[PDB]
DNA sequence: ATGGTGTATCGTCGCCAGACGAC
RNA sequence: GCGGCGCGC
DNA sequence: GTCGTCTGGCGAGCGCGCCGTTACACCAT
């Protein structure tokens, strides 16, 4: 019932905001009426009972107990826990505590049921225990001191006590890290951070400062008016409740009035000039109010000080000058010492959320006024509202939006604010992140956090990760903690050049956008009389294109400005990137704007804060990484790459010394900015006195060719297939992209032997680049539609004839990849067909496909039709790519966990492993070892057994279950390829 | 000159000064609303219809005819029927289904409401521009017309008269529009008053 | 079930069996035409008019109502009324003005002709697909429909059954037509013959 | 310096979820 | 929420 | 009414970010 949910939310917010007599009066009014005593459940009664219990108030709690007795309900363990907690606060006679313990022992309730089944705070548990110790001083709880340890086959050596322990440590002392924690706490207590922009500053003239002054006085008047309106609304809502009616007064009293008016002013500042829909604004205001309440409760509850103390104790493990009695993983150290853990947030009902948002929006619209005329003449003293309701058209619907006054928009445009705004969760952390200990506790301080980013579902994903035993997630959580404990810093030398090109006519070929002043102007203007029938009609065609180009340029410059502003904020600071995962298991950083899963500019601006000496082989790996980023030699062995690096050393030194003045050899590569960064690093390393004693901060990358086909070739143990994906050792690396390109080219020549024009047009216009993305994403589940879109996008950047609808190139790519399957990758075709058929037959029986990774992470597919039926099309076309993604995520997590034990700094881009230049060989050995160890287990047999146990278990529909069992017990036979040879392959990851 | 832009069918001025009743109709993508006046600014009726089978993807004209006939069946008789006129054009290709729905409804209302058109040749259904109404009521900010819920609330709680027995239900109906805003219900009354001020009684 | 995929409204077959007279109407960009047939497949009437001022750059319901009223004034009463149902799509971003013209034409013709609909809810106007016309007579190539001037020359200049009184007028109309796509309006007669063949 | 008005590209395909026949 | 783009695998 | 075969409409690999939702054209005290 909606009214019951509203009343329960009212009472919970009352006990959150200490407005207990108000809730008591409303409860009494509802209990008195015979028609209102119904739809009242025990949750409201014992919520008010616990609120009375928290601060003395024995008489009121006894009266609430009397109401519960008169209502005809039966009290539960939570009510008795509340009763025992009040008695503790103020010491009371022994007989009363007992005259209650015996009553709880009667009627079936247990003495220890409240301690385990009922979730209460530490203070409440301590008060209840002190209330029981008055009667029974010998009562005690089991300690359960030893934590559980994962004992799976793949994760056995990670958690083994015996062995060599070489866990890495940070380069910063304890006091500096404590100051960084304080800075992060002060930043995150506010919900918003202001950053100086990178756009070239304009000198403030007279009218600019006049606009700024009138903005200041308008904002002061708006703040006063909003405060008065909030006070009047609060008084009206309190008077409404005193008449025994539900209102939003406790929800409006969640925060201080200053915080609410600041939030309203900030959302007024960010409101678009054209406008935004009223419902979206209401939802945003309600969500911001809830988040701010969650953050600012922890100041007055006292959790901030406890978190500070436990953080200061925990950072002795990561400090350079501090030591621990026994080295251990960060999550295990945080699990000890009695550190607190975040509790799951209880979301509000949707109706009260929407009503609070609409109330705040109406307050903002009514309370804000401005003078009608911006001019100095103040005739007639006319005051008009700033925001109006406009019933406009959005999508193919009619929506009521909120629109500002054009005078306000002109005033905001005239006074150019040089400050951008960001959310505290959208910026990198200024202190080391919290260890991941649960799906709902980790990463950011003092803020709700979700382990999984899946917006769709989110109630079945979070149910499978909280039902499984806690050990099964451990190898994931540590892998998410290890990726979070990587200290980052900003390379300022690259940043100077990037901002130099940004604050000028930009260079779009290097990846920096251009200002709107260089938008393509129309060739000419219109005329009154058209000279030709073709005239006066193509002007719109060649002008709307220019407008679209200008809009795209504006969007690109906006995103570049945001990224560079956030990068310039963190120029002289060390920051950390907390990580989450999706439902498949793929890992992503939490800050979206500035991270290493980005373009060339974003990756070149990021460096390791901690550095290591190059050693005997660091410089060679740096040069091989530079050649790899250059892209000139991808089909050559490593020794020829090193020789090429030796040959072009003059260009490297010239690019490092003169990036934008002399020769520009770094321009002309696939990643010019990372190439320039590597050139500077190599130039510094060579010119040092000892090239092996040079400390390098530059990450070196090792990548697989096609990590989807690399897994398909190994689940089927396919012999000739594994040769093409470098699973078999060879002196020369094998490129699958060039072989597909060659096959499509020769069959295009064969088709052009016959009479076709599209084949003859595509003579010499097909290369590795046009097919690389498509071939890479075939194993990821692309269709011919998406493949054609990708090929059209790639062919719209050449000198191709205007026949850009190439439906033949995608057909040839799919067809001759399938022919390559028929020749050498037959296991891939067999396994993909088997997986698709199994997913289809599971979907037809009204079920969603669920499985478990070999690391123990449960995965469920959330695609459902608009309880609801599964979407069979999305359910059966996504199972093999999701399985491959789970497998490669498991491989990456295993590699990270086994590289941490050897003192390596490991960070992961999908399929790409980045580490220090002195640790490349160790990481390669660990990667090959974990790939052989992952595939030495019967993955397909275990999957079939799980799908025969989970699905195909009910005998109600025997006819479908029979075919399900025969298809599920039809695993393809493996080939004759030997897996151990992967340990001796040099180009498996390169 | 002003009446040419205000009113498109261009009915001669003598017929606009002898009216005894008027029905104002505003329809949207989800609902329709209409209001009745009897030359004394007295609201005889004020209704809206919300439940529709239209604008769901299928532009079948049979359900259009059935729905329009069911709406007209409840409409009483009057001297003239004023219909709203949106500013949408054929250039905006993104909003074409809305324009198609509006044009089909306007054509069917013109055909069905003009019961005795063929025998006399006189028009009984009028099209009024909403921008002119917004300019008349000072509801125009920039090039966009703003809502008039507060002005209708000022009316309900000289300019317009409400029958004594018919007030409270109307007020309750207004109290049914607090959670979700029905702009057509206010726009119908606003257009009726704009017609009685700009063309009649001028 | 075949008629459900050819006729848009869910009309009953028992009413289509007991028919006496049909009007078939086809409208285009510039002109309209219609034909009156009886149950004996006799061509009582066939008339085309091109006095439209509807589509001159401005769209207005008043001029549409005036022109449609004038046209429907010169039409005899018949049992059933049918008109073309060309299946253009909203998804295509072109040919919007002709689609809007077609929908406004269908709307006012549906309301204006379905007399006594308020008293009794019976649909006296129907729509039938152009593809059914192009497939039953088999004069249409794939994904198109070719002209049928040769077919109406085959009938004139037994299924059509032209009357003896007005045969000279029809012959004069056929002979004097050499442009303006008269066969694109004789698709009305073709559609009416197809309706008699399919619905009976 | 502004407001006055103005209106005729798609090109695939396969497959599964609602729709109508038999009981 | 829709459309136009861009980046990563 | 109910449920088994058939056909016609649906939608296109995920993850992240930005912007926009409403042609500009001719003219003169």
**A13, two tokens:** 């917010």
d(CA B21, CA A324): 92
**A648, two tokens:** 């072009």
**A469, two tokens:** 């035993």
A673 and A735 part of one domain: no
Residues 6+ apart with CB under 8 A from A429: A184, A443, A444, A445, A575, A576, A577, A578
d(CA B7, CA A978): 86
d(CA C61, CA B54): 21
The dihedral sign for the CA sequence A129, A130, A131, A133: positive
The answer to whether A612 touches A693, Cβ cutoff 8 Å, is: no
Q: Which resolution, in Å, applies to this structure?
A: 2.5
In a domain, residue A925? The reply is no
Would you call A911 a catalytic residue per the annotation?
Answer: yes
d(CA A573, CA B36): 70
Nearest CA in chain A to B99: A396
Is any Cβ of chain B less than 8 angstroms from the Cβ of C114? yes
Buried b / exposed e along B70-105 (16+ C-beta atoms within 10 A): ebbeeeeebebbbbbbbeeeeeeeebbebbbbbbbb
Buried b / exposed e along A328-363 (16+ C-beta atoms within 10 A): bbbbbbbeeeebeebeeeeebeeebbbbbbbbbbeb
Q: Which residues of B touch A389 (CB under 8 A)?
A: 146-147, 149, 181
By three-state DSSP, how is residue B81 classified? strand
* CA angle at B195 for the pair B190 and B198, rounded to the nearest 5°: 115
Q: Which residues of A touch B146 (CB under 8 A)?
A: 388-390, 403
* CA angle at A410 for the pair A405 and A412, rounded to the nearest 5°: 95
d(CA B6, CA B13): 13
Q: Are strands C125-128 and C80-84 parallel, antiparallel or unpaired?
A: parallel
What is the distance in angstroms between the Cα of B14 and the nearest Cα belonging to chain A? 35
Check B64 against C107: CB less than 8 A apart: yes
Question: Please, which residues bridge with residue A860 across strands?
Answer: A850
The answer to whether C35 touches C188, Cβ cutoff 8 Å, is: yes
User: Which nucleotide is at minimal CA–C1' distance from A602?
Assistant: E7
Q: Separation of CA A793 and C1' E5 in angstroms?
A: 12
Is any Cβ of chain A less than 8 angstroms from the Cβ of B181? yes
d(CA A420, CA A559): 12
Q: State the architecture of C3-199 in CATH terms.
A: 2-Layer Sandwich (3.30)
Interface contacts A/B by beta carbons within 8 Å:
38
Question: What DSSP letter does each residue of A337-396 carry, written as one string?
Answer: TT---PPPP-PPPHHHHHHHHHHHHHHHHHH-EEES--SS--GGG-EEESEEEEEEEETT
CB C5 within 7 Å, strand F: yes
Q: State the architecture of B2-198 in CATH terms.
A: 2-Layer Sandwich (3.30)
What is the distance in angstroms between the Cα of B140 and the nearest Cα belonging to chain C? 26
Q: Separation of CA A859 and C1' F2 in angstroms?
A: 38
Check B93 against C97: CB less than 8 A apart: no
Q: Which residues of A touch B138 (CB under 8 A)?
A: none
CB A807 within 7 Å, strand F: no
CB half-sphere exposure, A450, CA atoms < 13 A:
12
Question: Please, which residues bridge with residue A308 across strands?
Answer: none
Residues 6+ apart with CB under 8 A from A858: A464, A465, A468, A472, A850, A851, A852
Cα–Cα distances in angstroms (integers) from residue B9 to residues B100, B125, C54, C116, in the given order: 21, 8, 15, 27
Residues 6+ apart with CB under 8 A from A81: A50, A114, A118, A120, A124, A128
Q: Which method was used?
A: cryo-EM
A313 and A409 part of one domain: yes
Cα–Cα distances in angstroms (integers) from residue A9 to residues A17, A247, A291, in the given order: 12, 11, 16
Q: How many CB atoms lie within 10 A of CB A65?
A: 18
Partner-chain residue, chosen from B73, B111, B127, that has the shortest CB–CB distance to C118: B73
In a domain, residue A597? The reply is no
Q: How many CB atoms lie within 10 A of CB A313?
A: 14
Q: Which of A76, A124, A654, A911 is catalytic?
A: A911
Residue reference for tokens 């146990």: A949
CATH label of the domain that carries residue A635: 1.10.287.280
Q: Which residues of C touch B62 (CB under 8 A)?
A: 8-9, 110, 123
Q: Are strands A850-852 and A387-394 parallel, antiparallel or unpaired?
A: unpaired
For residue A707, which phi and psi values (nearest 5 degrees)? Answer: -75, -10
Cα–Cα distances in angstroms (integers) from residue A183 to residues A309, A434, A445, A575, A732, in the given order: 15, 15, 12, 12, 52
Question: What DSSP letter does each residue of A604-668 carry, written as one string?
Answer: HTEEESS-EE--SSHHHHHHHHHHHHH-S-SSS-HHHHHHHHHHTHHHHHHHHH-SSSS--TTTT
What is the distance in angstroms between the Cα of B193 and the nearest Cα belonging to chain C? 24
d(CA A485, CA A434): 9
Burial (CB count within 10 angstroms: exposed 0-12, middle 13-18, buried 19+), residue A647: exposed
Residues 6+ apart with CB under 8 A from C179: none
d(CA A580, CA A597): 13
The H or E element that residue A451 is part of is none
Q: Which residues of B touch C65 (CB under 8 A)?
A: 110-111, 114, 117
Is any Cβ of chain C less than 8 angstroms from the Cβ of B62? yes
Residue reference for tokens 């030495």: A936
d(CA A815, CA A748): 12
Is any Cβ of chain B less than 8 angstroms from the Cβ of C103? yes
Q: How many domains does chain A have?
A: 5
d(CA A18, CA A254): 10
Cα–Cα distances in angstroms (integers) from residue A146 to residues A316, A336, C67, C111, in the given order: 22, 10, 92, 83
Q: Which candidate in B57, B60, B61 is best for mutational testing of the C interface (most C CBs within 10 A)?
A: B61
Partner-chain residue, chosen from A389, A391, A396, that has the shortest CB–CB distance to B95: A396
Question: What DSSP letter does each residue of A272-303 carry, written as one string?
Answer: -SS-EEHHHHHHHHHHHHHHHHHHHHHHHHTH
Check B97 against A405: CB less than 8 A apart: no
Check C104 against B99: CB less than 8 A apart: no
A413 and A275 part of one domain: yes
What is the distance in angstroms between the Cα of A403 and the nearest Cα belonging to chain B? 9
CB A78 within 7 Å, strand F: no
Interface residues, strand E, Cβ cutoff 7 Å: A 280, 394-395, 548, 551-552, 555-556, 597-600, 707, 773, 777, 780, 793, 909-912
Per residue, what are the HEC states of A103-121? Answer: HHHHHHCCCCHHHHCCCCC
**Using CB atoms, which chains have 3+ pairs under 8 A with A?**
B
d(CA A258, CA A260): 5
Interface residues, strand D, Cβ cutoff 7 Å: A 784-785, 805, 807, 840, 865, 869, 871-873, 876; B 5, 87-91; C 1, 4, 55, 57-59, 91-95, 97-98
By three-state DSSP, how is residue A580 classified? strand
A275 and A419 part of one domain: yes
The answer to whether B183 touches B37, Cβ cutoff 8 Å, is: no
For residue A887, which phi and psi values (nearest 5 degrees)? Answer: -65, -45
User: Which nucleotide is at minimal CA–C1' distance from C2?
Assistant: D20
Q: Which of A703, A751, A819, A902 is catalytic?
A: A703
The H or E element that residue A848 is part of is none
Helices marked H in A382-473: 406-414, 461-464
Question: Please, which residues bridge with residue A255 across strands?
Answer: none
Partner-chain residue, chosen from A389, A393, A396, that has the shortest CB–CB distance to B146: A389
Q: Which residue is nearest to nucleotide F16 (CA to C1')?
A: A592
Question: What DSSP letter does each residue of B8-30 carry, written as one string?
Answer: SS---TTTTSS---EEEEEE-SS
Would you call A623 a catalytic residue per the annotation?
Answer: no
**C180, two tokens:** 């303006």
Is any Cβ of chain C less than 8 angstroms from the Cβ of B150? no
Buried b / exposed e along A146-177 (16+ C-beta atoms within 10 A): eeeebeeebbeebbeeeeeeeebebebeeeeb
Q: How many CB atoms lie within 10 A of CB A668?
A: 12
Q: Which residues of C touch B64 (CB under 8 A)?
A: 107, 110
d(CA A694, CA A615): 8
The answer to whether A508 touches A553, Cβ cutoff 8 Å, is: no
Find residues 8-27 of chain B whose CB sits inside 8 Å of chain C. 8-9
By three-state DSSP, how is residue A42 classified? helix
Q: Separation of CA A334 and C1' E9 in angstroms?
A: 33
Q: Separation of CA A801 and C1' F13 in angstroms?
A: 29
Q: Separation of CA C9 and C1' F1 in angstroms?
A: 24
Biggest CA pair distance of chain A:
107
Residues 6+ apart with CB under 8 A from A486: A576, A577, A608, A905, A907
CATH label of the domain that carries residue A793: 1.10.150.20
Q: Which residues of B touch A388 (CB under 8 A)?
A: 141, 146-147
Check A389 against B147: CB less than 8 A apart: yes
Q: Separation of CA A824 and C1' F28 in angstroms?
A: 79
d(CA A175, CA A300): 26
Q: Give chain E positions with protein CB within 7 A.
A: 1-2, 4-9
> Per-domain residue ranges for chain C?
3-199
Interface contacts B/C by beta carbons within 8 Å:
80
What range defines the domain where residue A546 resides? 490-522+542-576
Angle between helices A879-900 and A474-484 (to 10 degrees): 70
Question: What DSSP letter does each residue of B120-148 carry, written as one string?
Answer: H----EEEEEHHHHHHHTT-EETTEEBP-
Q: Name the DSSP letter for residue A473.
A: G
Is any Cβ of chain C less than 8 angstroms from the Cβ of B52? no
Name which of A78, A859, A55, C128 is nearest A65 in CA terms.
Answer: A78
Q: Are strands C21-27 and C32-38 parallel, antiparallel or unpaired?
A: antiparallel
CB half-sphere exposure, A627, CA atoms < 13 A:
24
By three-state DSSP, how is residue A765 classified? coil
Q: Which of A358, A403, A772, A876 is catalytic?
A: A772
Q: Kindly calculate the radius of gyration of chain B based on its CA atoms and give it in whole angstroms.
A: 17
In a domain, residue A485? The reply is no
């Amino acid at each position: 019932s909606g009214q019951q949910q509203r009343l329960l939310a009212f009472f919970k917010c009352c006990l959150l905001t200490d407005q207990l007599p108000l809730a008591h009066h409303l409860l009494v009014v509802h209990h008195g009426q015979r028609q209102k005593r119904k739809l009242l459940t025990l949750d409201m009664y014992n919520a008010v009972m616990l609120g009375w219990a928290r601060q003395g108030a024995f008489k009121e709690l006894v009266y609430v107990l009397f109401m519960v007795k008169d209502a005809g309900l039966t009290p539960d363990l939570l009510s008795y826990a509340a009763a025992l907690q009040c008695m503790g606060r103020q010491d009371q006679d022994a007989g009363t505590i007992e005259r209650c313990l015996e009553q709880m022992s009667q009627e079936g309730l247990k003495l220890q049921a409240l301690f385990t089944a009922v979730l209460l705070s530490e203070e409440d548990r301590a008060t209840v225990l002190k209330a029981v110790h008055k009667v029974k001083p010998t009562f005690s709880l089991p300690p359960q001191l030893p934590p559980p340890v994962n004992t799976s086959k793949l994760l056995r050596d990670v958690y083994a006590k015996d062995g060599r322990v070489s866990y890495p440590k940070l380069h910063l002392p304890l006091k500096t890290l404590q100051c960084l924690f304080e800075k992060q706490l002060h930043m995150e207590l506010a919900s918003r951070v202001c950053v100086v922009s990178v756009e070239k500053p304009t000198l403030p003239s007279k009218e600019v400062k006049h606009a700024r002054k009138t903005l200041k006085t308008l904002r002061d008047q708006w703040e006063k008016a909003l405060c008065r309106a909030l006070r009047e609304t609060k008084n009206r809502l309190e008077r409404e409740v005193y008449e025994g009616r539900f209102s939003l007064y406790p929800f409006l009293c969640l925060l201080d009035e200053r915080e609410v008016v600041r939030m309203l002013l900030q959302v007024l500042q960010a409101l678009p000039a054209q406008g935004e829909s009223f419902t979206t604004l209401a939802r945003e205001l309600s969500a911001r109010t809830f988040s701010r309440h969650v953050v600012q409760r922890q100041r007055v509850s006292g959790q901030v000080q406890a978190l500070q103390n436990h953080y200061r104790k925990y950072l002795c493990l990561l400090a350079s000058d501090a030591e621990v009695p026994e080295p251990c993983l960060p999550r295990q150290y945080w699990e000890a010492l009695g550190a607190p853990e975040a509790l799951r947030e209880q979301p509000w009902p949707l109706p009260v959320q929407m009503e609070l948002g609409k109330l705040l929006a109406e307050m903002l619209v009514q309370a804000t006024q401005m003078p009608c005329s911006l001019d100095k003449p103040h005739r007639s003293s006319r005051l008009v509202p700033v925001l109006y309701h406009v019933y406009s058209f959005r999508n193919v619907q009619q929506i009521g939006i909120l629109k500002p006054h054009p005078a306000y928009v002109q005033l905001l445009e005239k006074a150019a604010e040089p400050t951008l705004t960001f959310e505290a969760v959208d910026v990198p952390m200024l202190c080391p992140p919290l260890p991941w200990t649960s799906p709902h506790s980790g990463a950011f301080l003092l803020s709700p956090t979700k382990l999984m980013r899946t917006v769709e579902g989110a109630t079945q994903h979070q149910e499978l990760l909280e039902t499984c035993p806690p050990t099964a997630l451990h190898g994931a959580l540590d892998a998410l903690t290890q990726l979070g404990n990587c200290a980052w810093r900003v390379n300022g030398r690259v940043l100077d050049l990037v901002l130099q090109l940004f604050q000028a006519k930009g260079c779009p070929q290097l990846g920096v956008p251009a200002p709107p002043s260089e938008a393509p102007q129309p060739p000419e203007a219109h005329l009154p009389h058209s000279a030709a029938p073709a005239r006066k009609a193509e002007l719109r065609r060649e002008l709307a294109h220019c407008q679209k180009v200008a809009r795209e340029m504006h969007s690109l410059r906006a995103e570049a400005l945001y990224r560079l502003s956030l990068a310039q904020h963190l120029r002289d600071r060390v920051f950390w990137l907390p990580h989450n995962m999706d439902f498949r298991g793929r890992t992503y950083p939490c800050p979206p704007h500035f991270n290493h899963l980005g373009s060339d500019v974003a990756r070149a601006l990021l460096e390791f804060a901690q550095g290591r000496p190059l050693g005997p082989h660091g410089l060679d790996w740096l040069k091989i990484h530079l050649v790899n980023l250059t892209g000139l030699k991808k089909r050559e062995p490593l020794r020829k790459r090193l020789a090429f690096a030796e040959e072009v050393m003059d260009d490297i030194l010239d690019s490092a010394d003169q990036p934008l003045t002399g020769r520009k050899w770094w321009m002309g590569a696939e990643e010019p900015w990372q190439t320039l960064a590597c050139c500077m690093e190599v130039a510094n390393a060579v010119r040092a006195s000892d090239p092996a004693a040079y400390v390098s901060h530059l990450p070196v990358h090792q990548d697989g060719s096609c990590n989807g086909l690399q897994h398909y070739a190994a689940l089927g143990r396919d012999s000739v297939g594994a040769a093409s994906v470098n699973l078999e050792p060879s002196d020369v690396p094998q490129d699958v992209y060039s072989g597909v390109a060659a096959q499509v080219e020769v069959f295009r020549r064969q088709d052009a032997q016959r009479g076709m024009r599209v084949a003859q047009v595509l003579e010499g216009f097909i290369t590795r680049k046009v097919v690389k993305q498509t071939v890479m994403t075939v194993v990821y589940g692309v269709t011919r539609y998406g493949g054609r879109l990708q090929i059209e996008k790639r062919l719209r950047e050449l000198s191709d004839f205007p026949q850009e609808f190439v439906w033949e190139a995608s057909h040839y790519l799919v067809r001759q990849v399938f022919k390559s399957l028929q020749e050498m990758f037959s296991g891939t075709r067999a396994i993909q067909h088997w997986l698709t058929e199994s997913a289809r037959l599971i979907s037809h029986m009204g079920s969603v496909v669920e499985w478990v990774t070999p690391l123990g992470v449960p995965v469920i597919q959330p695609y459902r039709l608009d309880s609801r039926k599964p979407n069979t099309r999305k359910q059966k076309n996504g199972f093999p790519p999701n399985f491959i993604h789970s497998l490669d995520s498991s491989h990456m997590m295993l590699t990270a966990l086994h590289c941490y034990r050897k003192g390596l700094t490991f960070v992961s881009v999908h399929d790409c492993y980045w580490t220090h230049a002195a640790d490349v060989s160790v990481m390669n050995q660990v990667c090959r070892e974990q790939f052989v160890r992952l595939h030495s287990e019967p993955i397909l047999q275990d999957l079939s057994r799980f799908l025969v146990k989970r699905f195909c278990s009910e005998p109600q529909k025997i006819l479908e279950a029979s075919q399900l069992k025969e298809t599920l017990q039809a695993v393809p036979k493996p080939g004759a390829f030997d897996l151990e040879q992967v340990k001796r392959s040099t180009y498996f990851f390169s | 000159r002003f009446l040419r832009k205000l009113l498109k069918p261009d009915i001669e001025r003598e017929r606009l000064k002898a009216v005894n009743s008027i029905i104002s109709i505003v329809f949207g993508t989800r609902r329709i609303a209409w209001a009745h006046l009897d030359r004394k600014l007295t609201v005889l009726d004020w209704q809206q219809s919300d439940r529709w089978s239209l604008m769901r993807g299928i532009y079948s004209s049979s359900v259009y005819l059935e729905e329009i006939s069911s709406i007209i069946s409840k409409m009483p008789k009057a001297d003239f029927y004023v219909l709203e006129k949106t500013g949408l054009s054929i250039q905006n290709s993104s909003l074409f289904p809305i324009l198609l729905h509006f044009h089909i409804m306007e054509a069917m209302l013109y055909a069905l409401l003009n019961k005795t058109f063929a025998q006399d040749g006189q028009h009984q259904v009028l099209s009024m521009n909403r921008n002119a109404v917004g300019k008349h009521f000072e509801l125009m900010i920039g090039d966009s017309r703003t809502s008039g819920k507060e002005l209708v609330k000022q009316f309900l709680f000289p300019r317009v008269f409400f029958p004594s027995d018919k007030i409270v239900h109307y007020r309750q109906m207004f109290l049914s529009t607090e959670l979700q805003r029905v702009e057509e219900l206010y726009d119908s009354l606003l257009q009726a008053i704009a017609f009685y001020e700009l063309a009649v009684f001028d």
